[PDB]
Symmetry: D2
């Protein structure tokens, strides 16, 4: 299928865009052009050079100067931006520490997530309007965090938009379950996709209430697995939890499973931000890490060095699967192979007992021009109470951001499970973070 046009917003991205370049370079099902748009033209142009050195020539990349130009005639829109700068992020993630509040990531919920979301609203409002004006029939795939707020803003501003949010966190839990099947049953699992899960919740706080490998029910096995490794934790093969800030021993997941009876389906570093527990103040004991801003600064600098190397040497990205589903979803949407995978979309009943329209993560059936959520049922009662509460806050942030009502955003702030400090301290903190 030729002459596909993909518009890429955040096209100077050194993460999602690269990962998309790799997968495009190996899918023989498709060809076309990628319009790269970034507030920072310099980064977009380096991606144009790197992309045009990747794979066949199957995909032609172009750094473009405006949104309108990127979207014109686009069939797919990909969005992967950073709402603000590393300096903003420093505040997002670390300022609350002066009040005793710790955050492992800060891009989804808690104080960081609330404030980052406010900052993201007008960015997404503006993108929704551009997509409405220039490519209203395109499918939009959002990678940006906080994911529930960004995606929801897309639908508040352009009600008829065809948009999904994509996240890779559930994939990590499927891998965990694939290795468990081997360790507990001695049987090999070809691909993590073969771990068939009924996953539901909201981004970074998803839960698996049924799971199987072929004819085998995985829940009772996860029961024993969790019981055996609850204290020690469990490390993936060839990994140690201290290898990087992204690694863990799944102690937080095991602990949540004991309490709620569903399998937590995101990394420990994400799960820990959604509810009360000793996790965030004793990460070493719980065998995961917080991600500090020094890490992000360092990582940015070595991605920059990598980028400059690739150019100097006139190389493209590895022609190697990233493990993402972005290109698979795009192929599915174009009618080149149907797919059932987890996505974030407005709730119309696919998760029971949660507000309708709220952005929820579930399996969906994806085929030509169609993303169709699958009814996935109910969360455990305790998790549902927590999810309703976070959705409350997320809806308020999206509204607060569109109408510029800081009073309402502060209500959300005060309603967040991590903001457990006196009201006047929180107000000073909130105002300082704005």
């Amino acid at each position: 299928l030729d002459q596909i046009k993909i518009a890429y917003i955040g096209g100077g991205s050194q993460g999602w865009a690269r990962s998309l370049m790799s997968d495009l370079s190996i899918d023989e099902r498709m060809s076309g052009t990628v319009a790269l748009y970034d507030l920072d033209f310099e980064a977009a142009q380096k991606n144009e050079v790197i992309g045009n050195h990747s794979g066949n020539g199957r995909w032609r990349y172009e750094a473009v100067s405006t949104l309108k130009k990127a979207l014109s005639a686009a069939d797919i829109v990909i969005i992967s931006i950073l709402p603000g700068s590393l300096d903003d992020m420093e505040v997002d993630v670390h300022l609350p520490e002066r009040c005793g509040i710790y955050q492992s990531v800060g891009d989804t919920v808690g104080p960081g997530g609330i404030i980052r979301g406010l900052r993201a609203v007008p960015i997404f409002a503006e993108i929704a309007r551009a997509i409405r004006d220039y490519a209203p029939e395109s499918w939009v795939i959002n990678y940006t965090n906080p994911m529930s707020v960004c995606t929801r803003v897309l639908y508040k501003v352009f009600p008829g938009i065809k948009a999904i949010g994509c996240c890779h966190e559930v994939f990590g839990t499927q891998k965990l379950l694939a290795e468990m099947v081997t360790e507990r049953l001695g049987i090999e699992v070809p691909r993590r996709e073969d771990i068939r899960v009924n996953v539901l919740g909201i981004n970074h706080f998803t839960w698996i209430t049924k799971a199987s490998y072929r004819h085998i029910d995985l829940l009772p096995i996860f029961r024993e697995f969790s019981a055996h490794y609850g204290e020690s934790g469990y490390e993936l093969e060839g990994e140690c939890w201290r290898d990087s800030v992204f690694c863990s021993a799944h102690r937080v997941a095991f602990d949540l499973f004991e309490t709620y009876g569903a399998i937590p389906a995101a990394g420990d570093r994400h799960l820990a931000e959604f509810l009360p527990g000793p996790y965030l103040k004793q990460p070493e004991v719980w065998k995961f890490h917080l991600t500090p801003i020094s890490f992000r600064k360092q990582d940015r600098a070595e991605k920059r060095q990598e980028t400059e190397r690739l150019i100097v040497q006139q190389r493209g990205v590895a022609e190697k699967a990233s493990g993402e589903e972005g290109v698979n979803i795009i192929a599915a949407l174009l009618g080149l192979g149907e797919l059932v995978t987890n996505v974030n979309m407005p709730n119309q009943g696919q998760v029971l007992n949660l507000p309708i329209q709220a952005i929820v993560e579930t399996n969906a059936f994806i085929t030509r021009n169609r993303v169709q959520p699958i009814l996935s049922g109910a969360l455990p009662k305790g998790v549902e109470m927590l999810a309703a509460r976070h959705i409350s806050n997320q809806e308020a942030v999206a509204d607060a951001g569109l109408t510029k009502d800081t009073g309402l955003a502060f209500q959300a702030f005060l309603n967040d499970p991590l903001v457990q400090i006196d009201r006047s301290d929180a107000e000073q903190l909130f105002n300082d973070m704005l």
Copy 2:
């Protein structure tokens, strides 16, 4: 996967049971036993002998004398019975003709559909209580008509039951569309499965609002197709609409398409009973047939002869795929595959603007011990008005049956599109049919 147990209610069946046997005999994924139960033990016994002459010895068949014995330890329950005798049906289908009302099938809606549903209610209440008592955790596949009422009674009497209703009408529309692709585009379609349709409605009144073959949108093509063959009709390769009471030239489907803008997705003979039209009074002009009860008595008699033939020649069923999805669905339910196919289930949002709990037909994602409806959107407004109306009637019939409230059943009777006679004529007709 071995030692699976299927309970078959209506196990003397000479339609669905045979098709199930053929499909079982060629699937190498599974093996176990089929308990055949039927009020008429003689027929079940004959299916037992034909069954045990079919395939590899993969499946062992046993005719059993009671429901309890069929159900105990059952993993799957299939239901394919006739609610009443063919003598009862002669009344369902032909008596209203004295008041000028013709029916082509009379097993779904109209006067015969209503009376028939009424009769089926206490049969399925009893089946539901037995499944609850002996096989609470089995999956139940219902094939019996009136589909929406029977299936609904299962859930009303056993709210926790795991039941779907299955029908093959949508397959016939998929085959029609595959042939249209070949005729309009000149390209082959290898399987009717490759016609990926978004289908929705209630049984025998299903509609396709989106459809594709690979990258191609089929809806614009069906519009051309319909304009070209609207008058003359269109006949499947190597067929003539006169060949049997089951055949047509799709004139009714083309006519409904022009009116409603979605593709009607059942045979003309079924569609014709759901709405006002010239159809039922001029079936030969509309190029389809009515099915008189004599045809069914005749068909049954030649099926009886065929059955005696196989018993004499000590042969089993044809080891040939039936075209049905029953066995594929069972395999998916056991975790031996995953499948997206159309089924009947309680509405929890998969069809918009239709009462919740009512039995609707949509695609559903099926995997180990999971049937999960796919959100399929809205019908055309005209179609949705009719469907809400029939659903009203179906709900009232189910209630009327469980509470023996003939007054309420008469209200449904009166609300049926085919009953356009004075109220006293209808009351007299209704009482005669009871």
Copy 3:
């Protein structure tokens, strides 16, 4: 309370306007001005003249030539128009007779109701825009039929409108029940207001599921009353059902009660148009009348002579209570009393199992700048089925009118219980009336 401003759209009226003038001229709680608007300026003028010969000069009347002028600074907007002329109405009501369709009133449902609705849509869309632009904060009282459609158009076009539909039909059944108390119990009833009823449904198809007079439950009593007079009918004291086309012996209401078990709460002449029955073709057996358009023409001519009589003698209307609740609702809306009375308003749960947003009739609590519906429960099942079906047609008419979609209008026409003819006869009929 003084300097109230009321805008009257349709103020050339000779029904509601005159009746309003009476009620206004005797309420001591209020004073202000009435801006009379009417396509026919001359007739608005004559109400001006006659209004200004009424009351104390408590109310100053003024004919105004434009909506905008009328609406400016209005606290209350009253709408009482005739959608089209009496000649149009001759078509609505009598043309269908050629196909054997009879109508008693034809301003609400049936073929005449549908066509009249279509006609009234653009007229109400226009009024809705004016109110939005010139008097968004006013309370709006609609008296025009077809009530459910007109009022719904108001909300569809101006979502934030504060609008109710008012009808006097229920008062008639309250009067009936008041006479029944006297006849069955010997005790006097001071006012029909004291018959405290739980009323619900849609305009002209309202039902009373609970009723009382002080401590006495009227349902069991109506049951006896109904049993005793079902065959003979019951005529109001000092009345004979033949006195006028508005009179009846309640035989239809008794018949509907026996079937459904709630008290129908509109005149037989309206009820008879909503469901199948022998009523319309045997009006004398059922002791009610059809209203031919010749009667409306005669009636209008005398009202016109009366008009000119008053103008010639410098006389106004009579200072006498009309029996309506209009002025009393206005007073309650201004804070000068509070009130619980029946109104038509969008459904938000006040009637169970009926679509939301559909215009339904229930009791509401009315107070300063507030009309708040009272949860009234469910209709009997057969009645709910009928009402859902009418609501369906009504929504379809509203949409059809707003988008100019005759195709949709015809679907509603086809779905109307009074339209029991062949489709092609109905098509010809529909086009002839359009």
Copy 4:
């Protein structure tokens, strides 16, 4: 109306019991008997003796020793109990202080409310079964706290029960508003009931979003009132906030009003427990009191002395109105005078965006054998978020207490706005309070 029977559960009361006796003795609209039940039969007997010296002998009182005897043939059931004892309550209210958590009342939300709820659940389950068994048609009026949880349990255990919860808190805010009209307008207000408020929320956390005195809008006036007296607070005529643990200067309400823009409608001492604020830590700054359990024990001893005084003096209660609406509501339910007043009932739409079935407080229209909530619209967004959260907790408690699930009760405990401590601290506290 004579021979009415009222069952009083908790008929040993020295609070709601006495207030009822007073009000009964002055209402000449009614006559009958009161069956007094109380786990402490001697306390019920004393109310019998005191009761049978009260009124004209309008009401005869009888202490009965079983629920059966109390309930059988009852028209009205009143429930006014203390769930557990004053020692249990000492734990509810004061134990959490060891963790830095203060509570002003502890009978509604927070840790004490959650624990008291668990205690009340089985008591109300037992009462609901008895009412189902012996007086299914009675109207049930609940006064017991925790009110939301207590009333809900009645409906969970006996779904067809006819029950409301009654509380007097909103009356206090109507007085405030009455005195405000006089102070700000100089004009007098005859009755707190003339302050006509649109009130909604959950018990002890109700809000008034519209309010008036006749033609005057009270909200703009409360805005000025609140803005003037926000710092000083405002004391009622002839009152000083220090006068008793029940008084305040409305500083908390004024503060909530500035933040949310709706008039909070419960005393400061209840409001304080529902959200984060500095209120409970600086009560003296905010001009309200906490209620120590030592005060409750002293109050109980003085009530025991008054009881003995009345007996010895063979005096009944005073023939003086209590200010409650209890007897008024009873009269209305018997058909003796319709009434619009605030009650707690399952949510079916009367409050927007709040789960259905949940016990919510709004106006209802009460008449013969009918309590019909009035649609009251939405809370301010920030208040709705808090109420949904508290409702989540109340539903968890109702279930946990029935099904015994301390796991679920603990999630509710952790989701309560007053429990802002480490999870292991919370678990130790929670376990201790069990």
